[PDB]
Design a protein around this ligand. Structure first.
Ligand SMILES: O=c1ccn([C@H]2C[C@H](O)[C@@H](COP(=O)(O)NP(=O)(O)OP(=O)(O)O)O2)c(=O)[nH]1
Ligand SMILES: [Mn+2]
Ligand SMILES: [Mn+2]
Ligand SMILES: [Mn+2]
Lengths: 131, 137
């Protein structure tokens, strides 16, 4: 099964959207569009969360199915977040792996483990540039 | 091979934090996840602004100049998957449903800013169906 990052590549190729194979500095038009898409889904997640809190305040004992609008919007947020990486030509799974390494690694302590190394995303990008 | 949603499950087990099926959360957990989302959203916005500003100032960007934005986008992925995991909700199964509805947009037109729009007859994602099926298995 494809990862969610590979699904974004399939989406962008299917609509003729720019999706370079390697890290590519974007024109300002792409950056402003990605901001618009991120702002839309951030506001829609916030709305669904506010809703759920409003329902709990009225005593509601939510069920699993009540989470479906929120789950939806969280997935929309993933979709526009992966999408920005994909249009930058930046393999999202490679960047994620590095942020995951730094995060799982920091999780040994009680805070930083003695030999801890922060996420080196710049290094991931330079490794992506080559093939 | 492990997906990024499964990575969030491991991270939560590493920190002693998550349910195996869709589980309504207590309000304090909702407020916490919203705060993490808003924190990484702002850091992403800041990095988009910094790249737009350098471009407006006549700077020609390098691929390496994308490292801070790419970092913050991964950070936003991390706390977004983190919320789905803590809800007990399989992120990859919900993502596949949204993906199907977005692929079906391929014949639609584009907005003036580049945004892909919906073709006539487009049917939206059925996430509730996915959530219900994730309960019972
Ligand atoms: O250019 C685009 C346009 C949309 N999308 C994705 C993001 C999100 O998952 C969804 C946003 O499209 P719309 O704003 O048109 N609304 P949506 O499809 O989410 O409709 P609904 O709110 O009813 O589910 O499609 C992109 O990724 N790139
Ligand atoms: Mn949405
Ligand atoms: Mn949607
Ligand atoms: Mn961050």
């Amino acid at each position: 099964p494809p990862t969610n990052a590979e699904r974004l590549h399939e989406f962008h190729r299917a609509i003729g959207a720019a999706t370079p194979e390697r890290p590519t500095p974007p024109p300002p038009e792409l950056l402003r569009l990605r901001q618009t898409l991120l702002d839309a889904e951030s506001a829609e997640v916030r709305a669904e969360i506010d809703h759920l809190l409003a329902r709990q305040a009225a005593g509601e004992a939510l069920s699993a199915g009540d989470l479906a609008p929120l789950a939806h919007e969280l997935a929309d947020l993933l979709y526009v977040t992966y999408g920005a990486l994909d249009q930058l030509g930046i393999d999202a799974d490679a960047v994620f792996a590095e942020v995951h390494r730094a995060n799982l690694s920091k999780a040994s302590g009680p805070l930083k483990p003695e030999g801890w190394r922060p996420a080196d995303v710049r290094g991931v990008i330079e490794r992506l540039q080559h093939a």
